[PDB]
Paper text:
The crystal structure of the llama heavy chain antibody fragment VHH D7 was solved by molecular replacement and refined to a resolution of 1.5 Å with an R factor of 16.6% and an Rfree of 19.4%. It contains two canonical (CDR1 and CDR2) and a long CDR3 typical for llama VHHs with a non-canonical CDR conformation. The base of CDR3 is well defined and stabilized by multiple main chain and side chain interactions including hydrogen bonds and salt bridges with CDR1 (Ser31-Arg97, Asp33-Lys95, Asp33-Arg97 and Asp33-Ser100F) and CDR2 (Ser52-Asp100C and Thr56-Asp100C). The extensive inter CDR stabilization suggests a potentially lower flexibility of the CDRs upon binding to gp120. However, the tip of the D7 CDR3 (Arg100 - Ser100B) is highly mobile evidenced by the lack of continuous main chain density for three residues, including Tyr100A positioned at the apex of CDR3, indicating that their conformational flexibility might be important for gp120 recognition. The CDR2 of D7 contains Trp52A, which is however not solvent accessible. Instead D7 Trp52A is involved in CDR1 stabilization as observed in another VHH structure. CDR3 of D7 is tilted 40° towards CDR2 compared to the orientation of the CDR H2/H3 of the other antibodies, whereas the apex of CDR3 is also built by an aromatic residue (Tyr100A) like in b12 (Trp100), F105 (Phe100A and Tyr100B), b13 (Tyr100C) and m18 (Phe99). The decrease in affinity is mainly due to an increase of the dissociation rate of the D7 mutants, which suggests a change of interaction between the CDR3 loop and gp120 but no major change of loop conformation. Together, these data implicate that VHH D7 interacts via CDR3 with gp120 and identify Lys95, Trp96 and Leu99 as key residues for this interaction. The structural and mutational data presented here show that D7 does not expose an aromatic residue at its CDR2 and that Tyr100A at the apex of CDR3 does not play a key role in gp120 interaction and HIV-1 IIIB neutralization.
Three heavy chain only camelid specific antibody domains D7, A12 and C8, termed VHH, have been isolated after immunization with gp120. These antibodies compete with CD4 and b12 for gp120 interaction and exert neutralizing activity against primary isolates of subtypes B and C. Here we describe the crystal structure of the camelid VHH D7 and determine the molecular determinants for HIV-1 Env gp120 interaction. D7 folds into a typical immunoglobulin domain closely resembling known llama VHH structures.
Residue numbers in the entry: 1 to 52, 52A, 53 to 82, 82A, 82B, 82C, 83 to 100, 100A, ...
Amino acid sequence: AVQLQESGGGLVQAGGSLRLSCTVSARTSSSHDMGWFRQAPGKEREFVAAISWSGGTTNYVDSVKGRFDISKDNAKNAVYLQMNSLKPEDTAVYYCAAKWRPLRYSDNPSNSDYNYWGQGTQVTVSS
Protein backbone atom coordinates (compact mmCIF):
# COMPACT_ATOMS: atom_id res chain seq x y z
CA ALA A 1 0.00 0.00 0.00
CA VAL A 2 0.92 3.65 -0.48
CA GLN A 3 -0.11 6.12 2.24
CA LEU A 4 -0.64 9.82 1.55
CA GLN A 5 -1.14 12.90 3.71
CA GLU A 6 -2.11 16.38 2.56
CA SER A 7 -0.84 19.59 4.09
CA GLY A 8 -1.56 23.18 3.22
CA GLY A 9 -5.07 24.49 2.67
CA GLY A 10 -7.15 27.19 4.24
CA LEU A 11 -8.99 30.31 3.14
CA VAL A 12 -7.83 32.52 0.26
CA GLN A 13 -9.33 35.56 -1.44
CA ALA A 14 -10.38 35.07 -5.07
CA GLY A 15 -7.43 35.78 -7.35
CA GLY A 16 -5.03 34.54 -4.69
CA SER A 17 -2.71 31.55 -4.45
CA LEU A 18 -2.18 28.56 -2.17
CA ARG A 19 0.12 25.56 -2.32
CA LEU A 20 -0.93 22.09 -1.26
CA SER A 21 1.62 19.40 -0.41
CA CYS A 22 1.19 15.68 -0.25
CA THR A 23 3.64 13.55 1.69
CA VAL A 24 4.09 10.04 0.33
CA SER A 25 5.11 6.85 2.13
CA ALA A 26 8.88 6.73 1.88
CA ARG A 27 9.31 3.39 0.16
CA THR A 28 6.79 4.02 -2.61
CA SER A 29 8.14 2.73 -5.93
CA SER A 30 8.45 4.73 -9.16
CA SER A 31 5.61 2.70 -10.76
CA HIS A 32 2.87 5.18 -9.80
CA ASP A 33 0.86 8.17 -10.89
CA MET A 34 0.19 10.83 -8.28
CA GLY A 35 -2.94 12.94 -8.51
CA TRP A 36 -5.16 15.56 -6.95
CA PHE A 37 -8.93 15.22 -6.81
CA ARG A 38 -11.52 17.47 -5.20
CA GLN A 39 -15.04 17.26 -3.85
CA ALA A 40 -17.37 20.11 -2.90
CA PRO A 41 -20.34 19.24 -0.63
CA GLY A 42 -23.30 18.11 -2.71
CA LYS A 43 -21.11 17.26 -5.71
CA GLU A 44 -19.25 14.20 -6.94
CA ARG A 45 -15.49 13.93 -6.62
CA GLU A 46 -13.67 15.24 -9.68
CA PHE A 47 -10.19 14.84 -11.10
CA VAL A 48 -7.98 17.92 -10.86
CA ALA A 49 -4.42 17.03 -11.93
CA ALA A 50 -1.94 14.18 -12.17
CA ILE A 51 1.77 13.57 -12.66
CA SER A 52 3.67 10.41 -13.51
CA TRP A 53 5.87 9.64 -10.49
CA SER A 54 8.53 8.18 -12.79
CA GLY A 55 8.50 10.37 -15.91
CA GLY A 56 6.92 13.64 -14.85
CA THR A 57 4.26 13.88 -17.57
CA THR A 58 1.28 15.93 -16.37
CA ASN A 59 -2.44 16.14 -17.09
CA TYR A 60 -5.08 18.63 -15.92
CA VAL A 61 -8.83 18.98 -15.84
CA ASP A 62 -9.76 21.70 -18.33
CA SER A 63 -11.13 24.10 -15.72
CA VAL A 64 -7.78 24.47 -13.93
CA LYS A 65 -5.43 24.54 -16.92
CA GLY A 66 -3.31 27.69 -16.77
CA ARG A 67 -4.17 28.25 -13.09
CA PHE A 68 -2.94 25.18 -11.20
CA ASP A 69 0.40 23.41 -11.60
CA ILE A 70 1.20 19.93 -10.30
CA SER A 71 4.81 19.03 -9.51
CA LYS A 72 6.72 16.39 -7.58
CA ASP A 73 9.92 15.88 -5.64
CA ASN A 74 10.76 12.18 -5.59
CA ALA A 75 13.85 12.80 -3.46
CA LYS A 76 11.62 14.14 -0.67
CA ASN A 77 8.60 11.87 -1.37
CA ALA A 78 6.41 14.91 -2.01
CA VAL A 79 3.74 15.95 -4.52
CA TYR A 80 2.55 19.56 -4.83
CA LEU A 81 -0.42 21.43 -6.22
CA GLN A 82 0.32 25.13 -6.75
CA MET A 83 -3.03 26.83 -7.01
CA ASN A 84 -2.90 30.28 -8.58
CA SER A 85 -5.70 32.57 -9.76
CA LEU A 86 -8.10 30.89 -7.32
CA LYS A 87 -11.80 31.17 -8.14
CA PRO A 88 -14.94 30.64 -6.01
CA GLU A 89 -15.57 27.49 -8.13
CA ASP A 90 -12.40 25.99 -6.63
CA THR A 91 -13.77 25.70 -3.09
CA ALA A 92 -13.62 22.02 -2.12
CA VAL A 93 -11.91 19.35 -0.10
CA TYR A 94 -8.76 18.43 -2.05
CA TYR A 95 -7.42 14.89 -1.92
CA CYS A 96 -4.03 13.58 -2.82
CA ALA A 97 -4.15 10.16 -4.48
CA ALA A 98 -1.93 7.57 -6.09
CA LYS A 99 -2.38 4.79 -8.58
CA TRP A 100 -0.08 1.87 -9.30
CA ARG A 101 0.86 1.69 -13.01
CA PRO A 102 2.83 -1.04 -14.78
CA LEU A 103 5.82 -0.15 -16.97
CA ARG A 104 4.83 1.02 -20.48
CA TYR A 105 5.69 3.25 -23.24
CA SER A 106 3.22 6.09 -22.66
CA ASP A 107 4.01 8.15 -19.57
CA ASN A 108 0.69 10.05 -19.58
CA PRO A 109 -0.80 9.69 -16.08
CA SER A 110 -4.28 8.34 -15.38
CA ASN A 111 -7.23 10.53 -14.40
CA SER A 112 -9.37 7.78 -12.91
CA ASP A 113 -9.53 4.61 -10.81
CA TYR A 114 -6.88 5.65 -8.30
CA ASN A 115 -5.97 3.19 -5.53
CA TYR A 116 -4.64 5.17 -2.59
CA TRP A 117 -6.09 8.29 -0.97
CA GLY A 118 -5.23 10.98 1.52
CA GLN A 119 -7.58 12.33 4.15
CA GLY A 120 -8.33 15.57 2.30
CA THR A 121 -7.73 19.25 3.01
CA GLN A 122 -10.27 22.07 2.76
CA VAL A 123 -9.54 24.96 0.40
CA THR A 124 -12.03 27.82 0.52
CA VAL A 125 -11.99 30.76 -1.87
CA SER A 126 -13.85 33.87 -0.74
CA SER A 127 -15.41 36.64 -2.85
